[PDB]
Amino acid sequence: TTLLNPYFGEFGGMYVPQILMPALNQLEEAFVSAQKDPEFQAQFADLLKNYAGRPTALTKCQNITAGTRTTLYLKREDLLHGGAHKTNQVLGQALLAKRMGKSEIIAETGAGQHGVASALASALLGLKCRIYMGAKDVERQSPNVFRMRLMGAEVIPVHSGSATLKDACNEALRDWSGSYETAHYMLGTAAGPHPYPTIVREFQRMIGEETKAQILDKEGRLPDAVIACVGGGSNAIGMFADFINDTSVGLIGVEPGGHGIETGEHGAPLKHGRVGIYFGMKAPMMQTADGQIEESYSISAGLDFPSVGPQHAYLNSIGRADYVSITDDEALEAFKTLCRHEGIIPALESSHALAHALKMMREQPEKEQLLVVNLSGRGDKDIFTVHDILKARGE
Amino acid sequence: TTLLNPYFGEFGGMYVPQILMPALNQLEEAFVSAQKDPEFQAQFADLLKNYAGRPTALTKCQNITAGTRTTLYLKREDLLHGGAHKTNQVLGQALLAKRMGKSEIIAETGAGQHGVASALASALLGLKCRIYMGAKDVERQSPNVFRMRLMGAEVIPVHSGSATLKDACNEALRDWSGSYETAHYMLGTAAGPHPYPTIVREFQRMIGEETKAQILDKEGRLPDAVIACVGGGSNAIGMFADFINDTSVGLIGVEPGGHGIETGEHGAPLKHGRVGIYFGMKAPMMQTADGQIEESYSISAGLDFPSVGPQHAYLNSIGRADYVSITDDEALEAFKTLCRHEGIIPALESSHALAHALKMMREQPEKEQLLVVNLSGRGDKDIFTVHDILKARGE
Amino acid sequence: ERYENLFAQLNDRREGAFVPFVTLGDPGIEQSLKIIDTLIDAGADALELGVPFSDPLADGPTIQNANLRAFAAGVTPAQCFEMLALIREKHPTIPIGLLMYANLVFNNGIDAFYARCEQVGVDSVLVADVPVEESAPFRQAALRHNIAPIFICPPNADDDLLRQVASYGRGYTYLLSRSGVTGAENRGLHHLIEKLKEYHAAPALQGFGISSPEQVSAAVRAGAAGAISGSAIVKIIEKNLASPKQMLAELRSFVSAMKAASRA
Amino acid sequence: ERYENLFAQLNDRREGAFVPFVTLGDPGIEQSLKIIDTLIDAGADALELGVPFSDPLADGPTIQNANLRAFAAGVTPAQCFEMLALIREKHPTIPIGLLMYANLVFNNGIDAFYARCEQVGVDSVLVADVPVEESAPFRQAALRHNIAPIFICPPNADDDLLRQVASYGRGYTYLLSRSGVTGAENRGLHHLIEKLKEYHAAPALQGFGISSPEQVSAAVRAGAAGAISGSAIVKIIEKNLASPKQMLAELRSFVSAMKAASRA
Numbered sequence A, B: 001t002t003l004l005n006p007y008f009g010e011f012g013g014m015y016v017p018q019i020l021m022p023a024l025n026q027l028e029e030a031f032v033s034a035q036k037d038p039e040f041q042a043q044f045a046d047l048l049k050n051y052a053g054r055p056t057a058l059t060k061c062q063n064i065t066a067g068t069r070t071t072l073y074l075k076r077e078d079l080l081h082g083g084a085h086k087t088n089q090v091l092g093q094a095l096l097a098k099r100m101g102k103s104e105i106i107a108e109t110g111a112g113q114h115g116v117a118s119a120l121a122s123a124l125l126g127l128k129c130r131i132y133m134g135a136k137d138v139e140r141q142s143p144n145v146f147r148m149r150l151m152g153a154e155v156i157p158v159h160s161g162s163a164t165l166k167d168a169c170n171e172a173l174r175d176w177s178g179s180y181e182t183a184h185y186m187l188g189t190a191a192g193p194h195p196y197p198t199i200v201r202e203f204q205r206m207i208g209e210e211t212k213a214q215i216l217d218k219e220g221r222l223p224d225a226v227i228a229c230v231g232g233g234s235n236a237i238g239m240f241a242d243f244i245n246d247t248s249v250g251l252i253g254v255e256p257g258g259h260g261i262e263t264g265e266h267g268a269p270l271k272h273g274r275v276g277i278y279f280g281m282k283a284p285m286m287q288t289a290d291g292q293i294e295e296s297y298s299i300s301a302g303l304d305f306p307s308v309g310p311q312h313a314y315l316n317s318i319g320r321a322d323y324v325s326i327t328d329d330e331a332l333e334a335f336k337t338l339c340r341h342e343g344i345i346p347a348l349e350s351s352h353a354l355a356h357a358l359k360m361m362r363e364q365p366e367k368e369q370l371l372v373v374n375l376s377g378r379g380d381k382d383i384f385t386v387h388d389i390l391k392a393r394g395e
Numbered sequence C, D: 001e002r003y004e005n006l007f008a009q010l011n012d013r014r015e016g017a018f019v020p021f022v023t024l025g026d027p028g029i030e031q032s033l034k035i036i037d038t039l040i041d042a043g044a045d046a047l048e049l050g051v052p053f054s055d056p057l058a059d060g061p062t063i064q065n066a067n068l069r070a071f072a073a074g075v076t077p078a079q080c081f082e083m084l085a086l087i088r089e090k091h092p093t094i095p096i097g098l099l100m101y102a103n104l105v106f107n108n109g110i111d112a113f114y115a116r117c118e119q120v121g122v123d124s125v126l127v128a129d130v131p132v133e134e135s136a137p138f139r140q141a142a143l144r145h146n147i148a149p150i151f152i153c154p155p156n157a158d159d160d161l162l163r164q165v166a167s168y169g170r171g172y173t174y175l176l177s178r179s180g181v182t183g184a185e186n187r188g189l190h191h192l193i194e195k196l197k198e199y200h201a202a203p204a205l206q207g208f209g210i211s212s213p214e215q216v217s218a219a220v221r222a223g224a225a226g227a228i229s230g231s232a233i234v235k236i237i238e239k240n241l242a243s244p245k246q247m248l249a250e251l252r253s254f255v256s257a258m259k260a261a262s263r264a
């Protein structure tokens, strides 16, 4: 029994060990209470404005659309405190944790941006934070490990499995199943068991709300499409949510194609996996013929995850949103292009969204289209990875 | 002959080789023209808002003033695109460069934040950028070297002298003296020959303007004091300028004390040097008995400079602003304190200002005072330096 | 009716059940079959058997590593069902329960999974990451194929949950000793036991952190029908990988001692 | 009146001046004095001498490194004035000009600096980072102590600058060959020369990038009173640090050839 619908069509649910159901119900009740609480909303708004720096800019590209009929705006979540959109909903969930009388935080992280967000919110709001991170990600996103630890968070490398995001997720959930009486599990994406896909959407939806207001101010109309990368789905559903009922606005989500879909080394379950049950949810996943969960791959740690949030699977199934993929090399080209022609260093995650927008433009350069890309994070965490690659390719 | 006064009392002037005077006069005329040009001001404003992300937040500290009668706000220049206040005036000077028909940029950098700003503005506005950086700084601020180069700037290590900021300055000026017909020298601080101290102040003064509006909104009165670190002087004069005629508002500038003033290993010429002529200006400097320019020292590359902008020397001389120093260890403690108790990772430069504010509070904890610290940058560039230090100290 | 018959026999002897858990195919198919025959010969009243799964979220490191050993030996669910057929062919009455994760059941059809269970002679299935709230198609398929669906009673179960578990479950009720995941190193209630009896629930087996005879005796004295031990058993396997005969001897001693404690 | 007398003598012989630059104390005090005596013996008409400064902003790497060598030998401005006294004691009529950076002049009093210049017998001072716009206390102190203040005429000098340089300067006018900093590797105007003469400026010496006899001849043929060469000279010092006698021989050959070219 729940207050809110745990499903998006066939997808979603609460597929966790029985021991954790009361924690999930408690979280749902606290969220529903907080959403109607003017004092909670005021506190959340104040943190977003005066601490995190909202609203974020909407930047018109000056150079990369030259010679085409594409107008491109970037929603600048890279300018948020912490360096990514992750900070929005962590501030909200941290307030929920306090509301429920919890003093400890468990989080998982891949790119380290949710880890950094969790750590900074815990420092601000007086919570004890421990963060699981795959050992491969500890290496390729090292600047964020340093940032988390400087802010007093405990960072726990995970060496099992692929030593990436799904493995950090597993450990976080295992931890929570024994520590939920005192710890809140601050899940970092729009996935997992109900109520997390709903809470994460509602605490990220200011991205699309602001975007709509900003594009109406600057262009006097809605975008032809909004484009976002999709790991678990939080920055994309955050951008999408306020446009879902604007039927003329395209919603485009970009999964990581890794080395190419044909190689099987990717993170694109929505279009190339099949429905399964894992990480507390019924959702598309990368799985073997027998139903073992497959390891994903992406150059970007934040997209390196073998499933996807259930609301995206639903929006796809009814045709309201379209999903595509972008390979490592396509993302790297977009990264370089934004650096050199707009002076913005994007996260490699965000570079997948930008790459698809550039493709929409280049493939049909006389097509009139007004596009917004969600620039979900800055690329400081990625600059050593990208440098090593370019060097090992001449450049 | 100039349009504007090149001096602040005894300090300032245009002490450059004769060859460079027409370039300085041209720059002055272009600035005066641009300041009365509504189209220029609109373009500058648009970049500041929609590209750089102004206005920046004013954050009330929740935790670090507990148990005292100090109220502390941080002006969040760390949230500006690029990660520091440097971006403000680079956007303005880049527009001036274009206005003068220049297609090339020369810059010097120490912390690498002015370098990053110069590089991103050049990428955006279509300029060819070369950046001089001391070889010591190339090492201790390496993340910014990677960022500059990814954005297509040429970064030139300088091995002469102390291999830090003053040596990068020297090389930039030497370059300009031969390339001024096609290159604009984008000086990164409120120092050097007229008109740069004036231009840099006018293109940074939005910091104090915003601060005043924000503190009036939140507290209904002006601050008791505003506090900023001082390298060459740009973030401090940017914060100070709009308060200079508000006589009740204290202006406090914080020079780097390095290993301690008594060691001679510091960067605090305003209070511990004496007037000299160097880098195009008459200003306080660290110099030997014979008048050789001394090498400075600070743990923070952005403050590691043996002189100071002339307007600060003037404000000091008439008693309108007070200047103090903060040692390496004091700055490091402030860095750690902000990380762990407010969830903000500050630049080591900015940590000097914060350290002095914390001292004002701790020394007189029952003194009622409303303080603003200019948080001039974020500390991502510093996290590897700080980590290495803490490790080499237990921690 | 294998659980029903077992518990009736145990009740007439005033006895509790001891039920070991192992992972099927750990450390290899042949050695796993010998391990299981040893458990039974040493006095196991029933078995709980894991099918290796890539991401076992209710398991701690000991059983995580059991799954990995089985995968290193190339064990698949198909091979597990082959093993199950062989075990049942040898041992006609011992209740066999499977520990499953949802995706392995859901994968290519829930009904088809439980049908395969019935054909090889499995008696119960516990799906670890399906709470009662999501259980309808699983328990329906289970009952259609004469399989007992097993449900969990956690230490802080409210009355509604107690009533649901009593009504939906068959075979036995899993009485959770504590929160957390499986693990010997982490050791773990009369009110729950009495309430389950009041609501005519299947007999309760206590599990999680039971690694000593004293804990088994305590479970039965508190009124539980018996106890389950997994990690303690698996540790003996892990410790003796290079010494297969010593492995079986230590397994036999441990299982015999745990079973003796169930008579308290 | 040493410049006035020199240029009158050169004019009566229909001759241009050749004026070498070196850094005082490079590579050591004693070798520097021998270098300077060799320059004079080889035909130098006047000297331009640098006082080592920590941050010479108008100088390229060759003369930067000359300053560093002098500092490695422990050379101070006090020691430079000792050297100057010795040079003047040997050579009573040759014009001696100093290349100074502002802080060394300003340091402990502008007037006191020019007073020290007068006492040792210096004839001119060129302060490289003081433009005419900032020059008042410098040229006033210079004239009070019978020192010629030297000013720069850059290639793109406007008429106002030409008039100012003509009026303020004494001794000679420095005619800059090009923009940039000092350097042999970077080679560098009749209108400026004619205008300076029209305004009765001190006679023009062309400097920056003059490293060949051909350039000296070209300077004089264009109407300049002579030419200055620094980096070319200093390179010969740098090249022969381990061979002091070969150094002086190569210095002598070069200076003699450059002086010969001034007769064109």
Ligand SMILES: O=P(O)(O)OCCNS(=O)(=O)c1ccc(OC(F)(F)F)cc1
Pocket: A017, A018, C021, C048, C049, C058, C059, C063, C099, C126, C127, C128, C129, C152, C174, C176, C181, C182, C183, C184, C207, C208, C209, C210, C211, C228, C229, C230, C231, C232
């Ligand atoms: O002795 P331990 O600590 O290893 O515990 C052994 C348990 N093995 S099991 O098959 O009964 C078992 C039962 C339930 C489980 O998860 C659930 F409770 F969420 F459903 C996991 C394993």
Ligand SMILES: O=P(O)(O)OCCNS(=O)(=O)c1ccc(OC(F)(F)F)cc1
Pocket: B017, B018, D021, D048, D049, D058, D059, D063, D099, D126, D127, D128, D129, D152, D174, D176, D181, D182, D183, D184, D207, D208, D209, D210, D211, D228, D229, D230, D231, D232
């Ligand atoms: O032959 P080069 O290229 O080494 O040039 C030699 C010049 N040596 S100097 O003393 O006359 C000399 C003259 C003027 C200088 O700077 C100023 F023009 F800004 F004033 C610097 C050096």
Ligand SMILES: C=C(/N=C/c1c(COP(=O)(O)O)cnc(C)c1O)C(=O)O
Pocket: A083, A084, A085, A086, A108, A109, A110, A111, A112, A113, A114, A115, A165, A188, A189, A190, A229, A230, A231, A232, A233, A234, A235, A236, A301, A302, A303, A347, A349, A350, A376, A377, A378
């Ligand atoms: C998984 C992580 N990051 C994901 C991420 C993503 C993808 O996650 P979502 O689909 O939940 O937005 C996009 N952009 C940035 C900057 C990101 O850091 C993490 O930081 O833990």
Ligand SMILES: C=C(/N=C/c1c(COP(=O)(O)O)cnc(C)c1O)C(=O)O
Pocket: B083, B084, B085, B086, B108, B109, B110, B111, B112, B113, B114, B115, B165, B188, B189, B190, B229, B230, B231, B232, B233, B234, B235, B236, B301, B302, B303, B347, B349, B350, B376, B377, B378
């Ligand atoms: C010198 C540099 N930085 C100086 C700096 C300073 C000191 O320079 P000003 O005194 O000009 O603000 C303060 N804060 C930050 C973040 C800085 O990066 C540079 O980035 O080149």
Ligand SMILES: [Cs+]
Pocket: A065, A066, A067, A068, A069, A070, A071
């Ligand atoms: Cs366009």
Ligand SMILES: [Cs+]
Pocket: A230, A231, A232, A255, A256, A267, A268, A269, A303, A304, A305, A306, A307, A308
């Ligand atoms: Cs994904």
Ligand SMILES: [Cs+]
Pocket: A230, A231, A232, A255, A256, A267, A268, A269, A270, A305, A307, A308
């Ligand atoms: Cs995905």
Ligand SMILES: [Cs+]
Pocket: B065, B066, B067, B068, B069, B070, B071
């Ligand atoms: Cs306070």
Ligand SMILES: [Cs+]
Pocket: B230, B231, B232, B255, B256, B267, B268, B269, B303, B304, B305, B306, B307, B308
């Ligand atoms: Cs300084």
Ligand SMILES: [Cs+]
Pocket: B230, B231, B232, B255, B256, B267, B268, B269, B270, B305, B307, B308
């Ligand atoms: Cs200073």
